[PDB]
Amino acid sequence: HMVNSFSGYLKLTDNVYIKNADIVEEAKKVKPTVVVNAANVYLKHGGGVAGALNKATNNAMQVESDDYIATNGPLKVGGSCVLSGHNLAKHCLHVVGPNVNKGEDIQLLKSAYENFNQHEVLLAPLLSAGIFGADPIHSLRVCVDTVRTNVYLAVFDKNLYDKLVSSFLEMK
């Protein structure tokens, strides 16, 4: 029963850590209390992080998400809900970042990251930094400036990870 066992992270700030890792691989190893999903308002886990997380739960996440939506209706942009982490985590925090590609207000990225503050420790991706079309360096900046609790960020792409760490360490 070994919980929140993070290793090989670069410490960016007092509370923000980052690693070049697949968030699904990281969840299986770490067994975190909370894994964050980069969700849409309907919790349709069709691609990117949401897809990878759902497939790794063998579609238990999509079945549970469908029931949540049938009961409660869609999330707000910048909103969240806590559901089961299934085989990956105790809990999955489904957070909806703004879709900048549809012209959703980038300020809602701050609302989205404020959800992290309700949890002492999280494994998370960068919000809105996939098909939602926010600049990943911007997403990391809003995360660092907003989240006060312990966040371990998993960035899959080595090239993106390299840019993020460079940009961050160079200008502080």
What is the residue extent of each domain of the chain? Answer: 1-172
In contact, 88 and 27? CB cutoff 8 Å: yes
DSSP code at position 130: S
How far CA 55 is from CA of 31, 34, 44, 80, in Å, comes to 17, 18, 12, 21
Please give the resolution of this entry in Å, rounded to 1 decimal: 2.2
97 half-sphere exposure, CB direction, 13 A CA radius: 31
Residue whose structure tokens are 């939602």 = 132
User: CATH classification of 1-172 is 3.40.220.10, yes or no?
Assistant: yes
For this PDB entry, the determination method is: X-ray
Residue whose structure tokens are 């670069």 = 10
Task: Decide: helix, strand or coil at residue 56.
Answer: helix
Backbone angles phi, psi at 152, to 5 degrees: -105, 105
